């Protein structure tokens, strides 16, 4: 055979870890992204980009350590190590936040490689590729949040930083500046995630509580063997239970599993649409009728107006330290307060 | 409050007063719901991927399963092999009952 | 200047995987038949083409 | 003495509508309909919230 | 004290529910699963 | 105050998919009843 | 012209009908507040 055929044979060998053609893209990119995240959370500081200490060397713990986004002085630059910003200097590249761009780009290519890996393993095994279509959900989440949102904004600075407390900051910052809870696409995403968790729990409990008595032991995990031509749980009993308890029940296992697949994927894609909308500040921030009613009626108050006041407080009290490049200086008199209202 | 914006106000005030995001139990709950979504999607993908051909191309694959049938509608072995090749071989739920017990357990515990 | 792939590439395998029935399944079927689980709605769980084909010939 | 509207007929949509929790003056005191001087007083202090929550 | 014993009360309510349900199932005789020979829902008429 | 277009959008985007689904279901049931004994 | 061999019947289940009606009504409820603004 040819060289290509021999390489295909070697990459397809049944080893402990499958490599495949997609591995040539997945393994280096994912390995470099993970290693860069560890390096940033262990050694690299954020002092020259965010005015923050985010590293174990500076004294941070697992929650407060992060690979922070590049400085706002950089635009949407690729921040190549050899690029004009760093010019080959590793220290300056780390100080300007280039490690965040390294992690984000190599991680996006790692996600692409993992999706291709799912496709390739599905093709070789001989099954339908409903994986790498489920993973399109997380891929869309990553693309919309870590790539499309900063690209729509001023720079990479407003992307989420790769850390726990950094992610929490990003949540509160987006809530303050966009009112993302009020966004209907985010509502559909929340519904999808919570419904997927509900489906997982309810399906697990339903299967565990409708098993056939296929063993004499009280512990029933031994009663199942993979080479079974018979179903291990009663679908009829489960359908009767949920039809007389909830009013409706699944009767088709294939439809049930497709639904358990579809709900989180649809939720993630709707949330991705919402974040893409946020990328251009095209947000469902306010209801015009409610604002007009509150403006002409000081005694009119709803929880939406309280949320608007909370978002204004978040923005005003976090702008100075969250965006140090803007050099925001707000006197105490102009800072919103409940007593000030 | 028994509403949507009221719920958002409750969440924001709770985060302000108590810093629930830094609470390890809310982190466990977030892990529970995220894992529930991931595991529901994964289980659905593996079952739908390994559906045994019981239908023609002109109809939905869901009709390949008949309500009350005694045989299994999908190949557990094929899905197990695909999952054990997507990650290392050891990480795989060969037992269907144990897999469904874990599916029930994780989000409930979260 | 001075071979055909001959592969369909539009073909579903379309081979039905037959499953056999045992005595236990037959006993369950008889018990369900005695309770009317097979009468009532005959078109449930069947596609339009499947129901049409089964109604055309018995 | 600054009420908060959460009903559709008082200027709310589906998103902004809510059943407002009980009055802070009530605290966690049991507040059924018969423990209020008038039905208007019961509605003004968030009694339906307690009713819905308990049931 | 309040947080600890409230958590303990909740988890022991969970334990009571689990052990009471399993006691009922074991006394009735189907805590190991459905018999698959005389299935209770197969004798009940549909709907 | 509220726009004409807002009510029009809500009502039409509710009704048109609904009547499409109802028409499709009625057509399917008609095929089922015609093929089966009636 | 003539008889087209690619014609196929289209079927919608009652479950599918109810899923569709529920989806449309829920989307209408969700987006009505934003359309009315």
């Amino acid at each position: 055979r040819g060289w290509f055929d021999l390489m295909d044979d070697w990459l397809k060998r049944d080893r402990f870890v499958f490599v495949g053609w997609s591995g040539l893209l997945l393994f280096p990119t994912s390995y470099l992204s993970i290693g860069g995240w560890f390096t940033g959370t262990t050694f690299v500081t954020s002092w020259y980009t965010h005015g923050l200490a985010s590293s174990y060397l500076e004294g941070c713990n697992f929650f407060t350590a992060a690979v922070s986004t590049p400085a706002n002085s950089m635009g949407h630059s690729l921040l190549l190590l050899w690029g004009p910003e760093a010019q080959g200097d590793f220290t300056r590249w780390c100080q300007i936040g280039g490690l965040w761009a390294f992690c984000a780009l190599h991680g996006s290519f790692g996600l692409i490689g993992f999706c291709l890996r799912q496709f390739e393993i599905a093709r070789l095994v001989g099954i339908r590729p409903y994986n790498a279509i489920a993973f399109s959900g997380p891929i869309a989440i990553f693309v919309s949040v870590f790539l499309m949102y900063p690209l729509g904004q001023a720079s990479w600075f407003f992307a989420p930083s790769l850390g726990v407390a950094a992610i929490f900051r990003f949540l509160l910052f987006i809530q303050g500046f966009h009112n993302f809870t009020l966004n209907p696409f985010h509502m559909m995403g929340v519904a999808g995630i919570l419904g997927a968790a509900l489906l997982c729990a309810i399906h697990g409990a339903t299967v565990q509580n409708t098993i056939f008595e296929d063993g004499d032991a009280a512990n029933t995990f031994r009663a199942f063997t993979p080479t079974q031509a018979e179903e291990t749980y009663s679908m009829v009993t489960a359908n009767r239970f949920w039809s007389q308890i909830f009013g409706v029940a699944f009767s088709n296992k294939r439809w049930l599993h497709f639904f358990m697949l579809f709900v989180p994927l649809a939720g993630l894609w709707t949330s991705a649409i919402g974040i893409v909308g946020l990328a251009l500040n095209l947000r469902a921030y306010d209801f015009v009728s409610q604002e007009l009613r509150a403006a002409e009626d000081p005694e009119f108050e709803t929880f939406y107006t309280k949320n608007i006041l909370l978002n204004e407080g978040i923005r005003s009290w976090m702008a100075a330290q969250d965006q140090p490049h803007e050099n925001f200086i707000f006197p105490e008199e102009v800072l919103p307060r409940g007593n000030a209202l | 409050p028994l509403g949507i914006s009221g719920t958002f106000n409750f969440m924001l005030v709770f985060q302000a007063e108590h810093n629930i995001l830094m609470h390890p139990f809310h982190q466990l709950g977030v892990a529970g719901v995220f894992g529930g979504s991931l595991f529901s999607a994964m289980h659905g993908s593996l079952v739908t991927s390994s559906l045994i051909r019981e239908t023609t191309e002109n109809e939905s694959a869901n009709y390949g399963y008949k309500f009350g049938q005694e045989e299994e509608t999908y190949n557990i072995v094929a899905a197990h092999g695909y999952f054990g090749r997507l990650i290392f071989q050891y990480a795989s739920f060969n037992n269907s009952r144990a897999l469904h017990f874990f599916l029930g357990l994780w989000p409930v515990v979260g | 200047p001075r071979v055909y792939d001959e592969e369909d590439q539009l073909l579903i395998l379309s081979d039905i995987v037959t499953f056999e029935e045992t005595d236990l399944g037959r006993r369950r079927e008889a018990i369900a038949e005695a309770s009317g689980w097979y009468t009532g709605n005959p078109s449930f769980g069947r596609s339009l083409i499947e129901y049409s084909e089964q109604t055309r010939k018995g | 003495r600054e009420p908060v509207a959460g009903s559709l007929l008082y200027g709310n949509n589906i998103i902004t509508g809510a059943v407002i929790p009980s009055s802070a003056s009530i605290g966690i005191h049991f507040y059924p309909i018969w423990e209020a001087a008038s039905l208007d007083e019961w509605l003004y202090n968030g009694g339906p919230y307690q009713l819905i929550v308990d049931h | 004290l309040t947080c600890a014993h409230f958590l303990l009360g909740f988890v022991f309510y969970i334990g009571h529910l689990w052990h009471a349900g399993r006691a009922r199932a074991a006394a009735a005789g189907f805590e190991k699963g459905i018999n698959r020979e005389n299935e209770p829902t197969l004798s009940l008429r549909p709907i | 105050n509220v726009s004409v277009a807002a009510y029009l959008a809500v009502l039409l985007g509710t009704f048109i998919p609904v009547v499409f689904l109802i028409t499709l279901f009625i057509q399917s049931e008609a095929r089922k009843a015609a093929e089966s004994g009636q | 012209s003539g008889p087209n061999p690619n014609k196929q019947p289209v079927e919608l289940n009652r479950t599918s009908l109810f899923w569709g009606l529920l989806l449309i009504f829920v989307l209408a409820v969700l987006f009505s507040s934003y359309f009315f603004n």
Binding site: - | - | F44 | L8, N13 | - | - | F36
Partner: peptide, 30 residues
């Protein structure tokens, strides 16, 4: 006037739930 639309949508959703529960396709063994 929008309150009428909101109430109509909510009542329609509740009626759809009612018809899905009490007028579903009855499951049968095939």
């Amino acid at each position: 006037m929008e309150t009428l639309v909101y109430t109509f949508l909510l009542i329609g959703t509740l009626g759809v739930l009612f018809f899905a529960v009490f007028f579903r396709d009855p499951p049968r063994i095939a």
